[PDB]
Design a protein around this ligand. Structure first.
Ligand SMILES: C[C@H](OP(=O)(O)OC[C@@H](O)[C@@H](O)[C@@H](O)Cn1c2nc(=O)[nH]c(=O)c-2cc2ccc(O)cc21)C(=O)N[C@@H](CCC(=O)N[C@@H](CCC(=O)O)C(=O)O)C(=O)O
Lengths: 269, 275
């Protein structure tokens, strides 16, 4: 699948630069602006509408909704509206929600880990039953969640982080592919790269980073799917290898790396 | 011909930086500011006047006008006005138009490729008959369009990409044929017509070979060697890029080179070296 690149922007209360930041993302060549779903951050669909007003090309996605925060029928109302009123530019990433303090603050039942996955499952089933027009992404590495992505999702998002080894990712991607079966080729695979480390000596940088990861070898650090290290050409070759190995074609980076990663889009976008 | 360097800027509604952007282009050493003709973009001659008020040296050009948008007599009025009220600093690039939704939004007939090219031909003939004082550029790679450039234009702009009326980059070998086609049509007038091309990407790198290899992902129909010869791409250090542009002026005759707004700063070092 052809590469698509996203940047995870955080619309922050009291910060007045939202429109400018979204323009910079589009002008820098990103294909997708992604926003989170958290307390203390701007509301995601409202922020996406403000982004749509100052951009023309990028897709706009949640990355990812906390299923505990949304009533499925009312979420389907939101998604239909966001689709129609942006001209079809909205996608919806969903996940389980993992911060207990946010449930407590909002007066929601934390339940059990399995109850929180069932909330995601029930939401996915309802959104498909209501035929929402927005493409759906499912994120999370748990067995059941990956099964739900295999069943319902247009895009599956794998977490790379406690950074996951390339060998551990092999096992999660293989587990997903077994669940997806004959659907496998119809599901785009996403991951979020947590750090983009520009360096003219990736070998020395990796060896030095054993300071913060003494439990990994330098080769293991250079193979961590959530880290990209080196020059733009090296980073592009790393992403090409990771698309072959893991199937990852939809790659997101964090806001602080927007400019650091942009040269890679010039080679692969 | 001596090199001339342009940057294609997009004057955008709701973005208050137009004057600042135009001054940066001139201060960075560009010879030309180019603006498009599209719905949703600021109106081209009005944006050009705003640019002329804050710059002193650069030429200002359309790059390129959608011929379906303009009545030839009224366009001649605009061109004479722009010429006199800027002191001779305006040039007009013209093309056929190619985005069907813009025709439809403006209530214009998309028609056929034939009718869109005939509209360009009719407009060029009328502008020459009205003796407009602005230099005229004609852009596009179709046989009829390059024939019109050979007949009428002061500058011919060779497109480095095709797209069903997204972009597919054309090889250096195909560009060789397009330049030779134009030259044959131009005949004795060939040497009086400046040749332009737009570079789509300016990629600063210390490993041009590794860069080109990776870029095959975006252009699977090309080899790395072909990527390094694409006229729409500049790859390497500023010195390597300057040497490439010298080689491409000898191979293709390209002396008027434009880059896209995103690469304004990336390309400016090359201007330093070629001057
Ligand atoms: C559409 C284009 O024809 P062209 O003569 O090369 O260019 C015509 C116009 O697009 C051109 O004159 C300009 O108006 C376009 N143009 C702009 N046009 C505008 O209207 N506004 C602009 O601001 C503008 C800017 C601009 C900047 C640079 C540039 O190079 C062109 C620009 C083209 O891609 N032609 C292909 C043919 C494409 C086609 O018809 N079919 C496809 C599919 C084949 C099939 O399925 O049948 C193909 O042959 O590959 C070709 O010659 O090979």
């Amino acid at each position: 699948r052809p590469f698509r690149f996203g940047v995870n922007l955080v619309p922050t209360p009291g910060v007045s630069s939202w429109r400018e930041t979204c323009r910079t993302a589009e002008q820098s060549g990103y294909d997708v602006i992604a926003v989170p779903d958290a307390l203390g951050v701007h509301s995601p669909f409202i922020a996406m509408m403000a982004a749509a007003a100052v951009t023309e090309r990028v897709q706009l996605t949640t990355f990812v909704l906390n299923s505990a925060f949304w009533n499925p029928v009312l979420l389907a109302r939101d998604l239909l509206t966001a689709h129609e009123l942006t001209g079809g530019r909205v996608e919806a990433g969903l996940g389980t929600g993992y911060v207990r303090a946010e449930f407590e603050t909002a007066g929601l039942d934390w339940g059990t880990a399995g109850t929180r996955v069932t909330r995601l499952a029930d939401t996915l089933a309802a959104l498909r039953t209501l035929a929402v027009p927005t493409p759906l992404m499912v994120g999370g590495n748990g067995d059941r969640v990956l099964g739900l992505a295999a069943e319902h999702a247009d895009t599956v998002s794998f977490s790379g982080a406690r950074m996951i080894t390339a060998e551990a990712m092999d096992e999660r991607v293989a587990f997903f592919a077994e669940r997806a079966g004959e659907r496998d080729s119809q599901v785009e695979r996403n991951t979020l790269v947590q750090s983009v480390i520009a360096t003219d000596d990736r070998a020395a940088t990796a060896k030095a980073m054993r300071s913060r990861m003494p439990y990994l070898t330098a080769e293991q650090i250079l193979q961590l799917p959530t880290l990209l290290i080196g020059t733009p050409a090296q980073m592009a070759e790393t992403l090409l290898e990771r698309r072959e190995r893991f199937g990852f074609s939809y790659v997101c980076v964090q806001e602080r790396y927007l400019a650091a990663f942009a040269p890679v889009i010039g080679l692969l976008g």
